[PDB]
Amino acid sequence: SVDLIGINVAGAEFTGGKLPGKHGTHYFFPPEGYFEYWSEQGIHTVRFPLKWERLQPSLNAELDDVYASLVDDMLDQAKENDIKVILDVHNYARYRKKVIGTEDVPVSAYQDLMERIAKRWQGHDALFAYDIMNEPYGSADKLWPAAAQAGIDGVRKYDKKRPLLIEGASWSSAARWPRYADELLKLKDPADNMVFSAHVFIDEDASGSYKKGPGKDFEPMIGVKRVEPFVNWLKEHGKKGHIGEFGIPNDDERWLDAMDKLLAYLNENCIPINYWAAGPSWGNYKLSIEPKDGEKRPQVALLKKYAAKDNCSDFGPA
Ligand SMILES: OC[C@H]1O[C@@H](O[C@H]2[C@H](O)[C@@H](O)[C@H](O)O[C@@H]2CO)[C@H](O)[C@@H](O)[C@@H]1O
């Protein structure tokens, strides 16, 4: 099913500078019992970041069985708790700091990664979709459309049914989406099941740092206004959409009001959201909705409120 309400469960992509790194020290998968809390809160879809270099420490070669087995176990526990998972290659269109499409990371190497991801997990009932790359940016922007096509071709060799979540240039900015997304119109999916996925924060520079508070003259519809360029481009071109990353601090009611207004707008257009972020090792991270003693998480009640209003059967907009 297409749930409008989902969460990011981050941690497996942490500490990108430590490769391969050590599980429990540099990166973190959900412990056993982790998904139980979110299942009882009525959350049934999870977006799960992964690091390409840990999945595949050598281009064009087999996946690392140790890290991939941690993914196996995660998907099993999601199935235990009635959760479907979006796998997210959280790599900014780069492998070991080099852009997909340059000499050292040819698009064929990216295609090989996605072939291997799809081959290993297409048979897993808990797998919902592939977010084939998180936030292309910078020098990756011009090369990203060609990379995306190779990623699509790779998955479709082994999985011809699941949705493919296609992010855009410029950190997949929702507010800036129409400036660059026309180049994504050339993408071809034999299965005709692509969904575009933009990201939005409502701080000053949309970086999600929230260095400052809402400030005076704060516009509660700011979240709606920053996703309107994305949703209107989807309507103009007859495409389907998704918001794969959005989060707010827990310390100002004005943030919550804007998140309510955003979720209402997304509901009216059948656009799913993945809140950024839950996860087992976030510590004091200001956007975390993971339960923490000496923290309250008023974003969760808002998510649950709109999960009960979800009467969409497919990705919108209409
Ligand atoms: O949006 C999350 C993403 O933002 C990056 O900051 C961008 C920002 O998105 C953009 O709106 C602004 O104009 O430029 C900055 C970059 O200088 C940030 O670098 C990422 O870590 C983050 O994932």
Residue numbers in the entry: 1 to 318
Which sentences did the original study use to describe this structure?
RBcel1, an endoglucanase of the GH5_5 subfamily isolated from an uncultured bacterium, has aroused interest because of its ability to polymerize cellooligosaccharides in vitro under near-physiological conditions. After the glycosylation step, the donor sugar is covalently bound to the enzyme within its negatively numbered subsites. Transglycosylation occurs when a sugar hydroxyl group is used as an acceptor instead of a water molecule during the deglycosylation step. Solving the structures of two RBcel1 variants, RBcel1_E135Q and RBcel1_Y201F, in complex with ligands has brought to light some of the molecular factors behind transglycosylation.
Our previous study of RBcel1 showed that the substitution of Tyr201 with a phenylalanine residue drastically slows the deglycosylation step, resulting in accumulation of the GEI. A Tris molecule resides in the −1 subsite, as in the structure of RBcel1_WT. The structure of RBcel1_Y201F co-crystallized with G3 contains four monomers per asymmetric unit, with each monomer containing ligands ranging from G2 to G6 in the catalytic cleft. The presence of cellooligosaccharides longer than G3 within the negatively numbered subsites provides crystallographic evidence for transglycosylation. Several water molecules were placed in the model, but they are not sufficient to account for this excess of density. However, the presence of G6 in the negatively numbered subsites of RBcel1 in monomer B allowed the definition of two additional subsites: −5 and −6. As discussed in our previous study, a displacement of the Glu245 side chain to form the GEI, adopting the tt0° conformation instead of mt-10°, results in a change of electronic environment. In the structure of RBcel1_Y201F in complex with G3, the same displacement of the side chain of Glu245 was observed in monomers A, B and D, where a ligand is covalently bound. In monomer C, however, a G3 molecule occupies the +1 to +3 subsites, as in the structure of RBcel1_E135Q.
